[PDB]
């Protein structure tokens with residue numbers, strides 16, 4: 001398509017980004033997101049799709065790397081994805097990532113509730129330091 | 131060499147606020163046949179942060195708590211005044227406009243109150259576009275039985291409140307506020323069309339207020355505003371701030387979003403106006419025929435999530451077609467989506483054709499068209515403000531349905 | 547909001563003879579301070 005001089009549709013890039021996440025290819029998914037920015041598209045929706053695919057396909061470690069890059073880059077995630085990332089990290093014993101995200105969630109403008117605190121506490125209660 | 135090379139409002143309009151610490155920066159108040167407005171008096175260059183456009187001190191406002199108990203900020207009603215009993219007898223949920231109207235009429239009676247002066251720049255009974263002032267013949271031009279019944283209930287509720295509380299036995303200090311029902315109806319119309327509800331912190335007390343804010347109730351509505359309101363708790367000043375990073379040209383109108391997410395029938399019930407580019411307006415489709423949501427959004431460069439749909443105006447160049455109506459079309463059209471399944475063009479044409487037929491069936495319900503309504507407005511010479519408002523409302527809905535037929539035609543061809 | 551948590555502690559305790567040795571290694575065995583001739 002690029003070699004033919006045609007401009008890929010925003011939906012076309014989203015199909016490739018979602019496919020990359022299903023295989024756990026976070027590097028390719030991030031390369032395609034960079035192309036969408038270069039094509040002047042809106043990468044917020046495609047970034048959201050990439051993170052949920054990695055979480056769904058048990059690539060939580062890769063999902064955290066992609067999510068934090070978008071969140072630190074200024075993008076604001078959806079409330080459902082915020083609750084997904086915090087909960088999945090705390091179920092896996094990853095307090096460091098779950099605390100990083102919840103700090104970014106509040107910086108965006110979404111204040112943590114009892115649900116998010118209960119996720120962090122589930123890991124803090126097992127560290128041996130009350 | 132230099133040798134060889136909408137009317138401004140009353141100058142006293144800004145001055146009465148200015149001597150009481152109202153500040154306006156780079157904007158001017160201009161008056162036209164349709165009313166007051168706020169316009170950029172110069173090119174407002176973008177900055178890293180929101181620019182202060184107007185500052186309105188708290189003491190010039192009329193505010194009441196949204197939630198019971200009714201406290202007034204600033205407190206202007208004396209202890210024991212019979213007006214508090216009238217305010218206190220209202221329904222806490224529905225009668226916020228009656229409470230504000232009583233405060234407004236009470237404020238006009240006070241010699242020292244600012245709204246004694248500011249009230250002279252409020253629209254009169256024959257100039258306010260509120261449907262509370264509409265006659266039964268004006269409601270006949272709406273062509274919306276649901277909205278008409280809503281207005282009739284509002285007019286009945288407002289009138290019954292006046293008859294109950296302004297009977298013959300009330301004190302003179304109450305009678306002189308609303309000597310006639312039309313005076314009280316006008317006050318409720320001012321309350322509905324101009325009330326600004328915000329969460330404020332005053333001192334240490336955070337509460338929701340219904341506020342009558344002078345000079346900020348001159349900002350017109352836009353669903354793509356270039357300004358927003360911001361309460362500054364430390365000095366009790368309402369700020370009108372232009373959007374951060376947004377360049378505003380000289381003469382551009384300064385607008386705020388009165389009612390995010392609200393349809394034109396809600397804008398008509400509250401503020402007595404409607405917009406043809408309302409991005410939340412809906413149209414009842416059968417759902418038998420559906421188009422591809424992803425394709426429709428990408429054809430018109432509508433990006434974002436459904437609740438934050440916006441037009442990437444830099445991806446169209448000069449396509450003036452896409453506006454709030456097409457965004458409203460995306461939200462109201464029957465759509466299907468299957469993650470990344472593409473749509474068959476021949477099956478989408480059948481849906482587009484059937485959707486266009488259903489759009490024309492609804493236009494045929496209206497006795498006149500949107501062009502015939504537009505020339506009716508131009509031909510008016512002795513029409514009430516609400517009559518023209520009622521005609522603009524039905525024309526806007528026709529313009530919206532007509533935009534959907536145009537958008538579907540473009541979408542069907544751009545799918546090749 | 548979430549507090550910026552900061553967990554720092556200091557504790558004092560009586561010290562074992564083993565910890566005393568681990569500090570030094572290192573045994574001072576002579577009562578001499580400085581040589582008279584070499585001043586070393």
Ligand SMILES: Nc1ncnc2c1ncn2[C@@H]1O[C@H](CSCC[C@H](N)C(=O)O)[C@@H](O)[C@H]1O
Pocket residue numbers: 164165166167252253259260323324347348349350351352401402403404405
């Ligand atoms: N976008 C818009 N289109 C048509 N009328 C509008 C409008 N925004 C505001 N108005 C009018 O302005 C009123 C709100 S008060 C805003 C200023 C007003 N013109 C005045 O003289 O005080 C509404 O009743 C409505 O009639």
